[PDB]
C-alpha cells in the first residue's frame, strides 16, 4: 500500500508569536509553490493540491490571462537561486473563480514529480468552518519590515479570529465576507504580507495538515487590530473539485 498528502517529510518548526514569525525547516512544508513569471521574479505563492493542479489567489493572476506567462517553482526553500532538484513547471491553464472571489486554479503543463520535497496538501471537507482560536500556519517568501528571515521560506503560527470578532469596528469592520477567515495576534508583529498571497494557511488536524486558507489580503502587515484575511477553501472544495474533474 501507500499514502501521502498533508504529511510533510520533515517535522515543521515551532515559533509561537511574512513579517515576524520564523524561517521554516527546509522542506517541512512540501505543498508550498512559488508563482514566478517567465524570466521574472517570484511574486506570489501557491499550494499544490494535485501533481497537476495548484491553488492560488486570483489577484496574482491579474497581470496576464496567458497561462504561458506564468511559471511554478516546487520543492524549494530559497527564493533566490534554488537547489538543483527544485522543479520548475509551466502553467497550462488559468481557472479563476467565476464570481470574482480571490481564488483560482493553475493547471500545470506537466505534472509535478512527487518527491519527499514535494507533496500535495490535503483539502478540507466542504463548508467546514475552522474553530475560533485554532492555531494555524501561514508560509511564504513574502516581504516583511526588516525582520529575522527573508530570502528563505519563513512561517508563522497565528490564531484564527472568527468573522464574528474580526468584523468588529476595532478590527476589520465587517469587510470580511463569510467566504474569508481571519488569523493573527491583535498585537501585530507577526503576519503574512505582500508576496505571500496564494500561499497556504494550513491547520493541523490529527495526523496531517489540512489546507484551510489561501492568503489573500489585509490592512497592512502585522499592524495591530488588523489581522490577515484568507479565502475559506472549504467554501470552494466543491468548485475546485469540479474544475479538476472536468479539465
Amino acid at each position: 500500500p501507500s499514502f501521502d498528502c498533508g504529511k510533510p517529510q520533515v517535522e515543521p518548526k515551532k515559533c509561537p508569536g511574512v513579517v515576524g514569525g520564523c524561517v521554516a525547516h527546509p522542506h517541512s512544508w512540501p505543498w508550498q509553490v512559488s508563482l514566478r513569471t517567465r524570466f521574472g521574479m517570484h511574486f506570489c505563492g501557491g499550494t499544490l493540491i494535485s501533481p497537476e493542479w495548484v491553488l492560488t489567489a486570483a489577484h496574482c493572476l491579474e497581470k496576464s490571462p496567458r497561462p504561458s506567462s506564468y511559471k511554478v517553482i516546487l520543492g524549494a526553500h530559497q527564493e533566490v537561486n534554488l537547489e538543483p532538484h527544485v522543479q520548475e513547471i509551466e502553467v497550462s491553464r488559468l481557472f479563476l473563480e467565476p464570481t470574482r472571489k480571490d481564488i483560482a486554479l493553475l493547471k500545470l503543463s506537466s505534472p509535478a514529480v512527487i518527491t519527499d520535497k514535494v507533496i500535495p496538501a490535503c483539502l478540507p471537507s466542504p463548508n467546514y468552518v475552522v474553530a475560533d482560536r485554532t492555531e494555524c500556519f501561514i508560509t511564504g517568501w513574502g516581504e516583511t519590515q526588516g525582520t529575522f528571515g527573508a530570502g528563505l521560506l519563513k512561517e508563522a503560527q497565528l490564531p484564527v479570529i472568527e468573522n464574528k470578532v474580526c468584523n468588529r469596528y476595532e478590527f476589520l469592520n465587517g469587510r470580511v465576507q463569510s467566504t474569508e477567515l481571519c488569523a493573527g495576534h491583535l498585537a501585530g508583529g507577526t503576519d503574512s504580507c505582500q508576496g505571500d498571497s496564494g500561499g497556504p494557511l494550513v491547520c493541523f488536524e490529527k495526523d496531517k495538515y489540512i489546507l484551510q486558507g489561501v492568503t489573500s489580503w489585509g490592512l497592512g502587515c502585522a499592524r495591530p487590530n488588523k489581522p490577515g484575511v484568507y479565502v475559506r477553501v472549504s467554501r470552494f472544495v466543491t468548485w475546485i473539485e469540479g474544475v479538476m474533474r472536468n479539465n
Partner: protein, 122 residues
C-alpha cells in the same frame, strides 16, 4: 504604523451581487466611499455607490435591479460617555437620512452596507 484606512467618515460597500433565484453572480471586493457628516443618504445615492463598486470589480458589466429590503447600513463606535459601544443603524430610502457627526467619539466611523443585491448584467 502607516498601512492606512479612511481618515474621515466613509461608507463601505460590501455586497454580494446575486441573481433573483439567489444564485451568486458577482462577489466584488468591498470598496469604501467618503461621505460627509450632514449630507443626506437616499436610496438613490446608495445605488450610485453599489454600482460604483460593482464596476470596480466587474467593470461596466452588470447593473443593479433590487438592492434588498434589509437596510444594512449601520455604524458602530465606542461611546466614551456611556462607557459602552454604540451601534447606530439607518434605512435605505428615498427620503434618506442625514449623516450624523460622531466626531465626538470617532474620527473615521464606517457606515457599513452589507447586503446581497440583485444584479442582472448589462
Amino acid at each position: 504604523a502607516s498601512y492606512f484606512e479612511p481618515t474621515g467618515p466613509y461608507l463601505m460597500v460590501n455586497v454580494t451581487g446575486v441573481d433573483s433565484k439567489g444564485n451568486e453572480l458577482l462577489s466584488p471586493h468591498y470598496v469604501e466611499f467618503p461621505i460627509k457628516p450632514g449630507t443626506t443618504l437616499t436610496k438613490e445615492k446608495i445605488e450610485y455607490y453599489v454600482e460604483w463598486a460593482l464596476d470596480a470589480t466587474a467593470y461596466k458589466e452588470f447593473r443593479v435591479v433590487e438592492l434588498d429590503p434589509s437596510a444594512k447600513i449601520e455604524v458602530t463606535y465606542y461611546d466614551k460617555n456611556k462607557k459602552k459601544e454604540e451601534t447606530k443603524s439607518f434605512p435605505i430610502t428615498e427620503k434618506g437620512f442625514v449623516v450624523p457627526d460622531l466626531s465626538e467619539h470617532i474620527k473615521n466611523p464606517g457606515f457599513n452596507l452589507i447586503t446581497k443585491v440583485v444584479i442582472e448584467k448589462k
